[PDB]
Amino acid sequence: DALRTLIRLGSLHTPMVVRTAATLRLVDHILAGARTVKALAARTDTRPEALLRLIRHLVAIGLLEEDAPGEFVPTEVGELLADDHPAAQRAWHDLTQAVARADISFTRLPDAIRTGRPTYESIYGKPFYEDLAGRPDLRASFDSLLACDQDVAFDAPAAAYDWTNVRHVLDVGGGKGGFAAAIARRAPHVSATVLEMAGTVDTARSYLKDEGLSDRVDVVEGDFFEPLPRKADAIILSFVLLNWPDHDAVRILTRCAEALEPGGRILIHERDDLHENSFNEQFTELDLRMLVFLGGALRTREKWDGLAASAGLVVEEVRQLPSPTIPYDLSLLVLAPA
Amino acid sequence: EPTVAARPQQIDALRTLIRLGSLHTPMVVRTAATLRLVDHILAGARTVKALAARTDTRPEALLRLIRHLVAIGLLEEDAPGEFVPTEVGELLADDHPAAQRAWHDLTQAVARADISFTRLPDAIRTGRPTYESIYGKPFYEDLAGRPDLRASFDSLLACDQDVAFDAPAAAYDWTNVRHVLDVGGGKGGFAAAIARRAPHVSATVLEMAGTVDTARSYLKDEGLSDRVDVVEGDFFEPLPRKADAIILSFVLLNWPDHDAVRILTRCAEALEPGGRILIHERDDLHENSFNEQFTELDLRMLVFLGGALRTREKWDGLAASAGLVVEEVRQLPSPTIPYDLSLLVLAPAA
Ligand SMILES: CC[C@@]1(O)C[C@H](O[C@H]2C[C@H](N(C)C)[C@H](O)[C@H](C)O2)c2c(O)c3c(c(O)c2[C@H]1C(=O)OC)C(=O)c1cccc(OC)c1C3=O
Ligand SMILES: CC[C@@]1(O)C[C@H](O[C@H]2C[C@H](N(C)C)[C@H](O)[C@H](C)O2)c2c(O)c3c(c(O)c2[C@H]1C(=O)OC)C(=O)c1cccc(OC)c1C3=O
Ligand SMILES: Nc1ncnc2c1ncn2[C@@H]1O[C@H](CSCC[C@H](N)C(=O)O)[C@@H](O)[C@H]1O
Numbered sequence: 234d235a236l237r238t239l240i241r242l243g244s245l246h247t248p249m250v251v252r253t254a255a256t257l258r259l260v261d262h263i264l265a266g267a268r269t270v271k272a273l274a275a276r277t278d279t280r281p282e283a284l285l286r287l288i289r290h291l292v293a294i295g296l297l298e299e300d301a302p303g304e305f306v307p308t309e310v311g312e313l314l315a316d317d318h319p320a321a322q323r324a325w326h327d328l329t330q331a332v333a334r335a336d337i338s339f340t341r342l343p344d345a346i347r348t349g350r351p352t353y354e355s356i357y358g359k360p361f362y363e364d365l366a367g368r369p370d371l372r373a374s375f376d377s378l379l380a381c382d383q384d385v386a387f388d389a390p391a392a393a394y395d396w397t398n399v400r401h402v403l404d405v406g407g408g409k410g411g412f413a414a415a416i417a418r419r420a421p422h423v424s425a426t427v428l429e430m431a432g433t434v435d436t437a438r439s440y441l442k443d444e445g446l447s448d449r450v451d452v453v454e455g456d457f458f459e460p461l462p463r464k465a466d467a468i469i470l471s472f473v474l475l476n477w478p479d480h481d482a483v484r485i486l487t488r489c490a491e492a493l494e495p496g497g498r499i500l501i502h503e504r505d506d507l508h509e510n511s512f513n514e515q516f517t518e519l520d521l522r523m524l525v526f527l528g529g530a531l532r533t534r535e536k537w538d539g540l541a542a543s544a545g546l547v548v549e550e551v552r553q554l555p556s557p558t559i560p561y562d563l564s565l566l567v568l569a570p571a
Numbered sequence: 572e573p574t575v576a577a578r579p580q581q582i583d584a585l586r587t588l589i590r591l592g593s594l595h596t597p598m599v600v601r602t603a604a605t606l607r608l609v610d611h612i613l614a615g616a617r618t619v620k621a622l623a624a625r626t627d628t629r630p631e632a633l634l635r636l637i638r639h640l641v642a643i644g645l646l647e648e649d650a651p652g653e654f655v656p657t658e659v660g661e662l663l664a665d666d667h668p669a670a671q672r673a674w675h676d677l678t679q680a681v682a683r684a685d686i687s688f689t690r691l692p693d694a695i696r697t698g699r700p701t702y703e704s705i706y707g708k709p710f711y712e713d714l715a716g717r718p719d720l721r722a723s724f725d726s727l728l729a730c731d732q733d734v735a736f737d738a739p740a741a742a743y744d745w746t747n748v749r750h751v752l753d754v755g756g757g758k759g760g761f762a763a764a765i766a767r768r769a770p771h772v773s774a775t776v777l778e779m780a781g782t783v784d785t786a787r788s789y790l791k792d793e794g795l796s797d798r799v800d801v802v803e804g805d806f807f808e809p810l811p812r813k814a815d816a817i818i819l820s821f822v823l824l825n826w827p828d829h830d831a832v833r834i835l836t837r838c839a840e841a842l843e844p845g846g847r848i849l850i851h852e853r854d855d856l857h858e859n860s861f862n863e864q865f866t867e868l869d870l871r872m873l874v875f876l877g878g879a880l881r882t883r884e885k886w887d888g889l890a891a892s893a894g895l896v897v898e899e900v901r902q903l904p905s906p907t908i909p910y911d912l913s914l915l916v917l918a919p920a921a
């Protein structure tokens with residue numbers, strides 16, 4: 234049939250079961266020596282009968298399976314919730330850490346389609362980044378999720394750009410500094426500056442120090458809506474612009490253009506797609522998180538020309554690049570003065 | 572060293588996990604149903620503009636929702652402007668007999684109730700329902716103070732009530748039965764199937780406020796009101812009337828052990844000599860319970876109400892605790908579902 238296909242697609246059960254299995258460290262406790270439902274219940278601090286009801290469903294959707302009678306063991310797919318796995322999917326689905334917490338915003342998607350405005354504040358009391366400002370808790374969990382891949386996520390985009398005439402790089406909203414770090418060990422003559430918010434700057438400083446790069450890369454606390462701290466031959470916006478509606482994203486773009494030295498470029502590292510090619514799960518899954526968390530968006534190639542020009546810029550070239558960690562393709566846009 | 576941009580090793584399993592864990596997808600389906608998007612399409616809306624007008628949404632955000640409905644296979648582009656339901660998307664039409672638009676409608680009782688899954692970890696820690704922490708009252712008190720939710724719950728359950736009770740009504744010989752009491756009997760569909768099968772029998776449906784008016788007008792319209800009364804009450808309290816057969820159709824799964832024993836005792840107290848208590852529900856062997864068609868109802872029951880589906884062995888202990896015994900279970904096999912409904916017949920312990 235395919236009335237079972239519709240029920241599967243509309244199932245709230247399943248993702249909530251995946252996410253509670255992750256929050257409870259379920260797969261980790263089985264691998265650590267929890268053979269029985271009783272031991273698993275002890276380790277997770279759950280009721281044995283209700284845990285068995287959770288594992289019924291974890292078996293049905295393919296994440297656990299019975300080996301011996303009443304003895305449950307992670308499948309290939311279930312093993313991906315192991316906390317030491319490099320894709321960190323367990324963290325990304327933990328209801329205590331920042332991203333899965335924010336997905337609760339989807340419970341009010343109808344509002345966001347009605348208004349075009351984010352849902353997050355109506356649930357948690359503040360807009361997304363102000364919330365993180367007042368919870369060191371989720372500040373740190375968010376930074377660690379997005380930089381879970383730090384050591385390799387930026388190797389490819391840095392390899393695809395020519396750094397020969399670049400003396401200084403500004404990484405605007407550059408996270409824990411990973412993109413600055415990848416450009417640095419790719420191009421030894423280059424120095425860099427990371428601009429980020431409070432919390433994230435201290436964590437960026439310690440990561441850069443621990444890479445051996447504190448002499449080549451500074452971190453500066455600030456606000457990319459105000460003038461940028463320095464001038465630069467290349468300015469990076471990796472996963473920033475999608476957080477903001479058009480007007481805000483043109484303001485950020487415009488501040489970057491003002492900070493560009495003669496001949497420099499701006500590199501945008503997120504995701505886009507030709508309009509006709511945009512009707513896919515990768516583009517939609519991020520575009521809609523951006524709507525509901527932030528009032529942001531992903532933008533098509535065509536829509537990027539419009540934003541570029543509002544900021545006195547042209548889109549010069551676009552490559553697509555694969556993530557080394559997760560099933561997802563990224564885009565690197567290079568923008569020049571018009 | 573040179574850079575090589577490999578994809579991750581276990582990338583197929585990774586997209587399987589990421590897909591299964593995604594909340595946006597079931598929410599996109601559910602907002603499509605609530606917006607009645609597919610009925611607006613089938614009723615002549617061809618542009619995003621016209622759909623945005625009928626749904627009362629902002630065109631640009633509606634196109635974004637529509638984007639993901641295409642990727643998942645519920646909508647497609649027939650022509651550059653217009654979007655149209657697939658074979659699968661067609662089931663979100665409101666007059667489809669499987670009723671999935673209504674089951675996924677965030678404005679109606681069950682899908683609204685599903686938000687309770689957002690706190691499933693509490694339910695696994697405590698064994699206790701989540702619905703009250705979200706919506707302020709427990710499940711049936713909420714419906715009681717919310718006439719629209721009361722009616723949408725009743726109308727979802729009574730879906731095929733013209734037909735769905737025909738089998739359970741035939742799973743009992745009504746010869747030595749004068750009166751049947753259906754405890755929590757919905758809009759009176761089970762009482763109706765019994766009544767046109769067994770001309771000699773009278774029945775009373777016991778139900779809550781709201782549901783009773785709806786049961787009354789359905790029974791009136793079947794031409795059966797001279798044969799079937801309806802009585803507003805509480806099955807935790809003494810029952811309106813003694814009876815020869817007392818029905819409990821998809822009630823006990825709503826309740827934890829101790830509440831279902833209280834209900835079963837109330838049924839036993841109202842029972843005439845030689846009469847029987849008939850539970851219409853499921854009776855699945857634990858060995859056949861590791862599938863979505865069991866866990867969906869069972870976990871809804873955990874999180875909405877603190878209830879459970881009860882496997883084969885569990886009923887003997889529930890019955891005994893009410894001073895009853897399971898004489899036998901009659902299966903109700905059917906081609907539409909991989910599992911069996913059952914009719915458990917209960918007598919007094921001695
Ligand atoms: C499942 C795919 C993905 O992981 C893709 C992307 O994450 C990518 C890029 C990360 N990065 C460099 C920022 C990192 O390399 C990660 C492993 O993959 C990404 C991603 O980039 C973000 C989010 C994702 O869920 C994901 C992931 C997703 O689409 O889940 C539905 C956010 O939720 C998010 C929330 C709030 C603000 C944000 O912007 C700063 C993001 C965000 O950038
Ligand atoms: C499509 C599958 C199903 O309909 C199965 C079941 O319905 C049963 C009993 C119906 N009935 C008598 C009302 C119907 O006649 C048929 C025998 O299937 C049922 C079902 O029985 C219930 C629910 C379902 O979704 C379903 C459906 C389902 O789980 O969808 C995946 C509830 O949501 C629900 C919510 C709150 C309280 C409830 O208890 C009274 C229920 C409930 O009983
Ligand atoms: N007004 C503001 N000023 C400076 N940074 C901001 C900001 N608003 C949000 N940000 C930052 O921009 C970042 C987006 S996410 C991290 C992106 C990082 N470049 C990466 O690709 O991994 C967040 O780290 C957040 O700290």
Ligand SMILES: Nc1ncnc2c1ncn2[C@@H]1O[C@H](CSCC[C@H](N)C(=O)O)[C@@H](O)[C@H]1O
Binds near residue numbers: 805
């Ligand atoms: N205290 C109470 N007294 C009478 N009915 C109650 C009740 N608590 C819950 N119920 C009812 O029990 C029903 C469970 S669901 C509907 C069951 C119906 N017999 C059927 O097979 O479709 C609900 O209709 C609800 O109204």
